[PDB]
Design a binder for this molecule. Structure first.
Ligand SMILES: Nc1ncnc2c1ncn2[C@@H]1O[C@H](COP(=O)(O)OP(=O)(O)OP(=O)(O)O)[C@@H](O)[C@H]1O
Ligand SMILES: [Mg+2]
Lengths: 148, 49, 212, 49, 198
């Protein structure tokens, strides 16, 4: 039997990323760059798209690892920009079916730094469609817009 | 034949000496009423990589 | 030695407070719920650490009490740290009737399952129907609309007694329910064959009951 | 002494034990005890199988 | 077992009282010297203690402590009225700069009454008292009574401290910021507070 695999990860309107798509590897994928480049942010986006339960998500620093802190802020809100945001995964099933899972993220206006999540799933999408293009509208001269 | 008389007469004549029991009635935790959720909409745009 | 639990707290009390059952129970108890023999988990827990709980709650100026029938409950003092409230006279009428129903061997064959209609029928059989109707509405004279209003008030108060833990509804049918021994507190004014006035005085002195 | 008796009189559990006489109540209680012991014996025998 | 410092904390004589208060929803500010110091000292363990109830112990950035229940809270919850948040946002507005020179931290019921009547729209005022009301004296008297009532509720929450005499004059604590608006880089507090009140 052929085991399923994760094909790619897509980020839209995150802190520092407007619309970027990482193509995963069959065995190992590495992220490199100086401090503050955005590696841990990519990790966080992936896990958020995997388990959207907002009660659980808590992104501590790598230092202070293992300390149950109850911090005032879970650390997700700041990784998002104003407006609408997305995080999606493309997966090839053992049945060789292409399925796209993901979540729509959005900041909540108000003093409390809260976040809204709405999961969704797409099946049967043609192999020629890329999520980056599916989630954006081409407005103006190569100045695309994101769509709700 | 002990409680029949003992309890029936109490119910029959309660209003001549109405009495009430005491119970613990701890306060409820007051919370903010949730206002209608207002998200941030900004129609963001940018150059595509 | 220093940094040792015994310096600040008895081991058994800390062991109790660390149990997974405590928060539930605490929450409930504070809300006025009575604990009988049927909810094993809770009851057993109570039994195991009785004195520690009593000592604990004492800090609040509240007595954790154990009735002879085996049910636990909270009785606040005058200086209580936790508010205290009183039941309505309609609640008492339904309470004393539920008590007589529990005792009745004539209905023991039901295996504890009673219907709101049977309760209502017993109540009207004993109390003064037309005079009791005065509490539902000041103009009641036996009209069916007023009789249905009385039945609905009974339905509401019975639901309040359920929250207090005095009666349990069936899992799938809400027109039927089962009694528990906690109802015997409504007989506190007559369990001893003595002068009613003196009994009442004793009860108010103990903080069990208030007049109206 | 009177006080003691008065004290005790309230502490009776249910109707079948409503002998207003404490001392008289004792034996009834004990009867219950024996009853309960037999029921426990039968139940633990059932549990084994 | 149980952590030693947690046992120490809850063994303290101040705990029962503070427990009682917190469960009620009261906010602990810097004013309550002993309670605030106690929370500062034992926060790391009290947070864990209250997490067992599915309730969150939060320290606001301004400095005051309070409890926030989750959906699965073990503590029975209750919710404020619309008029309550209206008054709360008004008090947040009154925590102004000219306040210092205007009142030296001590207000009166009339200040709040007149501010509420002047700043709010008539329609939501009618919705507060009753939709059948229309600009009548009895409606204004009822609204005054309701204002006093909700102000006492807020005093229970610890938002506002009455000066110890029968008259209705009070001072506003920092914890009122909980009603306040979101602050963005360079934004003027007066403007944003008014924007929400509108
Ligand atoms: N919640 C947040 N609010 C504001 N800025 C944030 C937040 N989380 C991360 N940042 C900033 O985003 C940038 C990316 O941080 P991130 O941890 O993803 O980088 P990195 O390349 O993984 O770094 P490092 O390897 O040092 O952990 C950094 O400037 C960080 O300061
Ligand atoms: Mg990082």
């Amino acid at each position: 039997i052929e085991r399923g695999k994760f094909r790619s990860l897509t980020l839209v309107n995150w802190n520092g990323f407007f619309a970027r798509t990482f193509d995963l590897d069959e065995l190992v994928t590495t992220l490199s760059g100086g401090n503050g480049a955005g590696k841990s942010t990519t990790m966080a986006a992936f896990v958020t798209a995997l388990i959207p339960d907002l009660t659980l998500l808590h992104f501590r620093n790598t230092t202070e690892a293992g300390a149950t802190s109850g911090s005032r802020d879970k650390g997700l809100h700041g990784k998002l920009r104003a407006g609408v945001c997305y995080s999606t995964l493309d997966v090839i099933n053992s049945r060789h079916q292409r399925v796209v899972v993901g979540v729509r993220l959005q900041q909540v206006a108000g003093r409390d730094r809260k976040v809204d999540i709405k999961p969704f799933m797409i099946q049967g999408l043609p192999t020629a469609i890329q999520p980056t293009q599916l989630l954006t509208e081409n407005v103006g001269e190569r100045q695309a817009r994101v769509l709700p | 034949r002990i409680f029949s008389q003992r309890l029936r007469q109490s119910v029959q004549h309660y209003f001549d000496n109405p009495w009430t029991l005491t119970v613990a009635n701890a306060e409820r935790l007051l919370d903010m009423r949730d206002e209608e959720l207002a998200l941030r909409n900004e129609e963001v745009t940018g150059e595509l990589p | 030695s220093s940094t040792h639990i015994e310096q600040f707290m008895p081991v058994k009390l800390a062991q109790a407070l660390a149990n997974s059952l405590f928060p539930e129970l605490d929450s409930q108890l504070r809300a006025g719920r009575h604990i009988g023999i049927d909810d094993l988990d809770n009851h057993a827990f109570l039994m195991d650490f009785q004195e520690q709980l009593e000592e604990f709650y004492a800090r609040y100026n509240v007595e954790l009490i154990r009735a002879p029938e085996g049910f636990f409950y909270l009785r606040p003092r005058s200086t209580t740290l936790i508010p205290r409230s009183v039941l309505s006279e309609l609640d008492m009428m339904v309470g004393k009737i539920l008590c007589y129903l529990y005792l009745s061997p004539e209905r023991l064959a039901n295996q504890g399952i009673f219907t709101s209609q049977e309760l209502y029928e017993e109540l009207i059989s004993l109390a003064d129907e037309g005079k009791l109707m005065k509490f539902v509405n000041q103009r009641s004279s036996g009209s069916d609309l007023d009789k249905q209003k009385l039945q609905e008030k009974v339905r509401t108060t019975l639901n309040r007694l359920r929250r207090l833990g005095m009666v349990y509804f069936l899992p799938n049918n809400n027109n039927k329910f089962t009694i528990t021994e906690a109802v015997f507190r409504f007989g506190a004014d007559v369990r001893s064959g003595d002068d009613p006035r003196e009994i009442q005085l004793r009860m108010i002195r103990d903080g069990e009951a208030m007049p109206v | 002494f009177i006080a003691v008796y008065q004290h005790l009189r309230e502490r009776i559990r249910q109707d079948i034990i409503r002998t207003d006489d404490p001392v008289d109540a004792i034996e009834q209680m004990e009867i219950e005890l024996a009853r309960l012991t037999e029921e426990l014996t039968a139940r633990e025998q059932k549990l084994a199988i």
